[PDB]
Every structure is written in C-alpha cells, then in structure tokens.
Design a protein that fits this description.
It is classed as virus like particle. Keywords: Storage, virus like particle. The structure is cut from a larger assembly and holds five copies of chain A. Chain A is of the alpha/beta class and about 260 residues long. In chain A, strands 5-13-10-6-9 form a five-stranded mixed β-sheet. In chain A, strand 11 and strand 12 form a beta hairpin. Chains in contact: A-B, A-C, A-D, B-D, D-E. At the A-C interface, helix 2, helix 5, helix 7 and strand 8 of A face helix 5 of C.
C-alpha cells in the first residue's frame, strides 16, 4: 500500500488512489508509442538492464534501462485548505508531470536515448528508408505508403503495419482523395490496419511505418508509470512521477521511415 | 543433484562427484587470480551483467559477465571398460580442461 | 428544504420543486459551456475566490468567483388564480430567467468577466489563434479546422478536442463536402471527439477549439443554479435564479481560436 | 496429455509449454487468411502422409503429397534461467516470429501453390476462370469487374456463397465511394460476397480471386495443425520448431475466378 | 431405416445419414425451382401419374411423373482406406450427383420433359410473352420488367411475382439505375415480392415472371431426393440420387416470358 509505504505523506489512502488515477489517465492519453508497441511485462526491481537480440543470425546488446521522471509539488497551503473545506485536491500538477514524462518516453522511443546509447525508431541502424514526394498533391501520400509497404514486404515483413506521422504530415491525409472522393486518411487506414497516429516528437515532414508485433519491437517495462513522495521540503510536498522503460528493436528491418528529401 | 540433473549421464552420483573433485582440484592448483582477489558472489544465475563504479584518481560501467568454458570428451569405450573391470573412471582429460578454464580466467583477469 | 428555508414563500414544497425543475431543465437546455468543461465542485458557500495556476508555454492568480443572477417576478394575482382554479402554477417567466443566467455564464465562459478581470476562451492570453479563410466555399471549413487542430497537436495537445462555433459558422458546416459525398459537419465530428457545439454568444464568423481535460481547464462552482426568494415586494413574489461560477484556464495553449481577418 | 511428458528433456514446464502454444497459435491466427474461408479437412493424423484429390473439371484423381512447413527458433538457456530466477514469464518473441513465418508459408502455398510437389494454388490451378479487370482507380469499374467475375461463376453453375481475396492495394481501392449510389463500393461488394472480403500480402499488384466457399468445392487437408516440437538440445541452448502439414485440395477448379491485371 | 433397407450397404447408419445430408444440402443449394413453386406432396410411391387441369384464358391432361436420377460410384478402396484410418467417408462425388439431379429438375421445370411431353415455364402454351429490348443500357431492364409485369396485371394476376433470369440478365440488373442512385436490382426486388432468382438453365438473354400461388402452378413430388443402393458391382458401390417430380401449370396466363428478338 502507498499509505504505509509513505507514512509521512500528507495524502490519505484515497488521495493517493486519486493521484495515481490522475497520473495514469494523463499518461495513457498522452502516450503514442504504447498504442502500437507492446510491453515486455513488468520486469520489476532486480532487472536494471535488458538484453536485445538484434536480427539483421543475431547479435546481443546490453541495454541499460533509464529512468524518466518529472517533479511536481503539492503546496501545504493548498493541501490544508482542501482538508479544511473538504473540497477535492487539485492534482493538475500531477497530470502535467505525467504528461511531461509521457512526452519524454515518446522522444526516447522515436529519437532514441543518445546519452545511454539506445537507438530509436527514427535512427536505428539497418532500418529501411523511403523518400516521400510532395504530399500536398492528392494521391501522392497514398502511393508513398504503398511503396514503403512494399519495401517492408521485400524484407519479409507482412504486417500488420502501424504508421506514425508528424503533425504537419498528419494534417495532410485529412484531404479528399481526388481519385476516390474520400479522405486520404481512410485509404491509408485500410492499408495500415494497426492505425495511423500523430506525434509532436516528429518534426517537419517525417514519419515511420512499423510492422507491429512483439517479435519485431517492444518496450521493456522495469516499472510502469509510478508516483513517489520525495519527502517534505520547505514545508511543501514534492512528488516524483517516474518510469523505467527502454525500447528494444529486435528486427530493425521492420521499420521503414519516411524522410523528406529536402 | 547431478544424477537427477542429467538423467542420461553415464556417470553415477559417486562417479560424477569424482568428476567435480578432479575439476575443482585442478582449478585451485592453477587459479592464481583468486589467491589474492576477493570473490563477490556467488551472485547466482539471475545476474548476467554487473555495474562497476570506477573511482579514478565516479564512472559507472555495465560489465557483462563473460562465460569461459572448455569441453573435453569422455569416450564410451573407456567408460565401458572401466565398468567391466570395476576400476575407477579416468578423469585425466577432465583435469586438463579445468587447467584451461583456469588459464582462461587468468588471461581474462 | 425550501419550505423551511423561506417560510413566507407562497409556493408549497411541491410548487417549489416545480420551480427548481423548470429552472434546471431550462439551464441544461442552454448551458453549452458545461457540455465539455469539467466541473470543479460544488466547493460550497465557504469559498469566495479560487487560485488558478496558469502554465504558459507557473503563475498563481487569485480568481474571485463572480455571481450571475436573474430576478423575474411571480405575480400574486396569477398565483391566487391558480390556487382558486386548482391548476398548476405557470413558471414560464422562471424558465426565461434561467435562460438568461445560462446565457450570462456562456458570455463569461467565452468572453470573460471584465469587472473581475477573468479571461475567457475567446479572450485569454496565451491561446492559439488561427485565421479562417472563406468558409462559404465547400471544403474550406474542414481544412481550417484541420490546420487549427494541427496547431494544438504541435503543442503536445493530442485531444480529445471540443469545437464551439458561432451559429453562422455552425450552419455553414452542414453543407455536403466537396468531393467526399459526406456532410462537412460529419467529417468535423469525426475529427472533434468531444462534439461540435454552437453558442449564440460568439458573434459573426468565430469559433474555438478546446482540448478537453480537467488538467487543461475546469469550471469552479461554489453553488450551482439556485432559486432564492427575495421577499414579497408590492404584493409580488420576486425570486432570483443565481449561480457562482468561474472559468479557470490552467493551460492557455490548449485553446485554439478561430477568427476572421 | 501434456507436452512435458512428450519432451522430458525440454526446459519448459507444463505452463511454459502452454504459454508457448498460445504464442505460436495466436501469431498464426492473426496472419492466416486462407483458413478464414476454406474448410479444414482433418486433422487426418500422422498416418496420412499424402492425400487423394478428385478433380471435377467442367473427373480425374490426383495424388497430393502433404508438404511439411516449418521454421526454427532457439531459446537461450541463460535467458530461461534468468527469467526463472527472477520469476518473470519467459519471452517467447522468437516463437511468434517463427509462427508468423509459417503462417505466411501456408498462405503462399494456398494461393500460389507449391512448385516442389506440384500442388496447384488458387491463382495457379488449371481449369479456373480468368477475368481481366480494368482500371479500378476510375469509379464504377471496381464493382462492375466483380459482377462480371461473379457472373462467370454463375454461368458455371456456382451460385455462392463467394469469398473474395484481394491484394492489399486493391482492397484499399474498394473503399472508394460509388459514382452514382454515393455509397462505398465495399458494402456493395460485401452484399454480393457474403463469406467475407479479405486481403492478403501474398497477392502483389492488381490481383485477386473469387472463391466459391464449400467443402465440395475446396478444402484444406491437414494432418497436423500448428505444432511446436522441441528439437534436441544443442550447445546448451534449446532450439524449437514450429511445423505443420497442410495441403490444399481444389475439387472444383471452375469454382475459382481469378482477377488478373492485363 | 437405410441400414435394414440395404443390408449389403458398406455404409453404416451414421455413414448413410452423411450421404443423405450431403445430398440434401447440395440439392437445396441448387434447387431454384422450389424457391418459389409450392410442393404438392409427398404423394407417395402409389402415384405414378397426376391429372392437371389447365385453365386457359378446363382441360384435363394426365401428366405421368418422370424420374430424374444420377448414379455416381463409391469406390471400395476409398471406403476401406477411410475405415482403416478412422477418417470420415468422402462424399464429394455424391454431392456432384445431387447437383446434377437438381440441374435436371430445373431443366425439366423451365424447359419441360420432351420425352413425356410435359411443358415448362419457358415453353408452356398459353403463356404471356414480352420482348425485351437492350438491357445493357441502364434503366431498360427495370422498364422491361415493368411492362412485362403489366401484362400479368391485365390478366387479373396481381402478384406476388417471382422473376427468374439467366445469369447474363441477372448480372445486368446489378448496375446502378439511371438517375435514381439505387441499384437496378433493388428496384426490381421491390417490384417482385417473391424474390429475383437466377438459373443457369436459361441460356442467353432470357427470363420468366411467374405469379406465385399453388392455385396457379405447383410441384408434384411422389418422392423427394432419395439415395438408393444399386448393389455392389465390380467391388464398387454404385448408388443413385433420384427424384420423381413433375411441374403442373394450371394457369398458363400466370407466366410472363422474357425473350430477345
């Protein structure tokens, strides 16, 4: 129980449950990687690093599981007032902390952890590369997905695929396909059966198509989104929303990234 | 024990202990690294890498634990002859392999 | 209850409940702000001001809670005639007052309280602004929402979105899309999960897209829609439909504003 | 009847083999398209190493040798011991990769046949009906070409239920709206083809097939379903094999109409 | 049952039921005549001819009931192998024979039995004939059915109608109507209540509209689809899927025939 694990926490047992629910909901809504990337279970404490068998015949690399955390403070003045007036505690800072960690996880998933030598979907060595034309013209976007989908088929990756695009590129499939008089997102969704997602972590005209499946890539969860009481500091109550996650890319050939030539 | 760990092993429990004692004695007679370097363990099979904090005159480096091995072979004709003549099983080749694992550790150390 | 709260009230307990039900129903049919903005309350009568932490893309501002009210009057001749003829009491004027408190809240939510210096959805500082083009031509309305929603997506606001448009723009969404044989409102409704609403408070061609979530913006209610007897005056029975509400915009970057040049 | 006694030397217990079976089976179900509209004739058993097919051309008996499709994956003993020590479920990711490869092999054999044993496929069997489709990018052509293909099956005394399997590109093109009806062509096709419209990566380009569902028309003759067999332990590691023995019998070749790009 | 009816049958009771179920299912999937023509029976084995009263727009004609059959053969090597390996007996050849008896009935129903001089839907004397135009152009198919159905309506035949078309014409009905944004088959299906069917027996561009009702036309079955052992011959086990059926057209004016010039 979180009540007995932090005896000095001002929050009661029910308040921690509300705080946990706020962190979980804010993280789940803001997380785009976990939508199409499976979790390698709760590894728990006692597994500080994980082994990834890269297939290009396999080679082994020891991946250190990094910690992603954000700190938020529950002021005692606000806490005492809520207790005095019996009004619910506002955990908006907790939601922002979970949102910031979720943004950090997405950056680690896509662009990798440079300081920990952990690659991401956008820079993993051996991934397929496709160059997209002018997506402003109708029909070019669908053809690029078709060409990139065939590229994954050439490397023995039959799907189902998941496509993640930058918000600028994502707000381009929301156009009527002049050939079929339907939204271009609908045609892509038929080809990309695992869904089409947006992510602010991708900048400019960039995207990635990932053949979904735990045998191609997954996330090693040492500990899911958890909150911890850092202890009283200056009469206030700071908390840490932390998570220990690393991304394993077992078959880099299953990732085809759409790169703007310009 | 060893007999239930390898049910197909031609060596019995007594025969397998002599295999272990021969290997252990040959290792101790050749392990010069363990004569002055303390042992941090046995950690167990659940540990495949260790964290080393290097205090230069800290830096944390994840040292994956290597596995050093030598194979050697116990020929069946020798084992059958020993059983027929009720003589102890010769483990000279086993001791030779242990002298090569103890030489591999010293090279690695 | 109400009878013991106002012993001099001409309305009995049953008559006063009909006053409350009429006020509540008229408020719900007109409250567009509460359709997508979560409620932080009821705090109670012990709270007169709230603290808003503005996370710009923190700043603590003490927002005093305004009180919005409409009076209306129940004439005694009508009440006496209803009692004599054993007919139910007419509360049409009561519903009209509730429609004006629900219009006052929408004005305060969308345009802000100037007297108490509280910002609104269309007025807060730090919001995102998108300049719409010509929505009269079919297909422009969907494109303008797409680009405006893209601005929210670039700020790590990935929905669910709630879009409120002026009736002029809201009706413009009901034309069939250019070459997709589907109503333009239907495509927008797929894009905006929380629903596309309309409010008369927005004048001309204007609208707003708000990323829902109590961590982004919330509504602080010390007391919801309540009806209070003001005491008999001139043989009449004046009442007051009042509420104490305030809008806290914690994340101004979660609001995208559509205006015309 | 548990696989623990079947493979006493296996390192997996009863539960671990059970988790291995679901991993292989689930990855197979997600990729098996032919099994959706083709009935299963079996499991015949280990005593059937070859099946007899009676072709009713519009009668000739052909002996088909049941092929064995397999893929090998290896579980490392260090990984199994590490998971066992930490009370973590075993990572069967390599099993899913092996199962997915075998599932693609079965689909490839069903559609394009098996040249090694001269077993015909849906797109390769002699006596099938051929329809030369038009430009499906233009409106109306996609629905009409299916109607003529269905009419070809109707003229050959086959009145349904039909099953339509299209290439992934053509399946998306069927999502367009009809020129006059202002309804998506897929619902018009789904009313004509009541056994389901499927898509498969095996078909490349403008390709597809209409199949009259029914045991008397075609069925899958299997002697062993998706089974994971533990090979001998080699080099202290544990290699496995996901194998199956399946052959496709087309009793009525005229019940298959293939859409071929001119 | 079957086992005591054919004591020398290699098939057991369970094996023989699968023979019957396979034959029955294959017959139902191919019998288009029984989908709209009512059954007058089963009369039984004591009836070999029926009397048809033809009401022209009565004449009594003795219609002898023909017997339609297909043989097929169950080879003993296949049966022995199935028993040895404990696998179910393959009845694919049995289903093929049933598909040929169901095709023989449709040929006899639609074109008549020339040997017994029994008329069919496309051949009976006293029917109505409509000359279709060019069904390739959209909208002509619906108009041709409308005028042809009008001929039946002028003869006090007010439905329900059943329309059977050749596959060439049946597929031609699946195009979208000219300017009504609705499939042409759907409009015809509204006109024809009993349903629009297709039969391979009709060659080229041809069809028929029949006003349903047992007082207009019916099917006389002394014995339905039955499987009989013909006795072992050459170690094989030949069977016979047979039926004794005849079509009685009591009101030839209730049939409208669509042909091309």
């Amino acid at each position: 129980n979180k009540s007995q694990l932090y005896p000095d926490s001002p929050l009661t047992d029910q308040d921690f449950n509300q705080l946990d629910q706020t962190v979980i909901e804010a993280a789940r809504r803001q997380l785009v990687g976990r939508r199409f990337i499976e979790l390698y279970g709760p590894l728990g404490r006692g597994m500080q690093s994980v082994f990834n068998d890269i297939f290009m015949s396999s080679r082994r690399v020891n991946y250190t599981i990094p910690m992603l955390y954000k700190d938020f403070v529950l002021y005692w003045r606000d806490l005492e007032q809520s207790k005095a007036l019996d009004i619910p505690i506002d955990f908006s800072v907790a939601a922002n902390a979970a949102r910031d960690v979720a943004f950090l996880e997405d950056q680690m998933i896509f662009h990798g952890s440079k300081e920990f030598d952990i690659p991401g979907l956008m820079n993993v060595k051996g991934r397929l590369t496709h160059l997209i034309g002018n997506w402003y013209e109708s029909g070019n976007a669908f053809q690029d997905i078709v060409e990139a989908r065939n590229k994954l088929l050439e490397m023995n990756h039959n799907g189902p695929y998941a496509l993640v695009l930058s918000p600028e590129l994502y707000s381009l499939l929301h156009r009527v396909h002049k050939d079929t008089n339907v939204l271009e997102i609908e045609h892509v969704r038929e080809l990309i059966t695992a869904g089409v997602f947006q992510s602010p972590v991708l900048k400019g005209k960039s995207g990635v198509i990932v053949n979904t499946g735990r045998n191609n890539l997954d996330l090693a969860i040492s500990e899911d989104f958890e909150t911890a009481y850092l202890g009283e500091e200056g009469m206030n109550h700071p908390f840490r929303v932390y998570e220990t996650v690393v991304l394993r890319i077992k078959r880099p050939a299953a990732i085809c990234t759409l790169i703007d030539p310009e | 024990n060893k007999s239930q760990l390898y049910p197909d092993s031609p060596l019995t429990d007594q025969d397998f202990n002599q295999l272990d004692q021969t290997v252990i004695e040959a290792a101790r007679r050749q392990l010069v690294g363990r004569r002055f370097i303390e042992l941090y363990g046995p950690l167990g099979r659940g540990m495949q890498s260790v964290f080393n904090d290097i205090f230069m005159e800290s830096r944390r480096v994840n040292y994956t634990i290597p596995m050093l091995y030598k194979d050697f072979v116990l020929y069946w004709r020798d084992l059958e002859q020993s059983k027929a003549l009720d003589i102890p099983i010769d483990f000279s080749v086993a001791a030779n392999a242990a002298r090569d694992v103890a030489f591999l550790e010293d090279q690695m150390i």
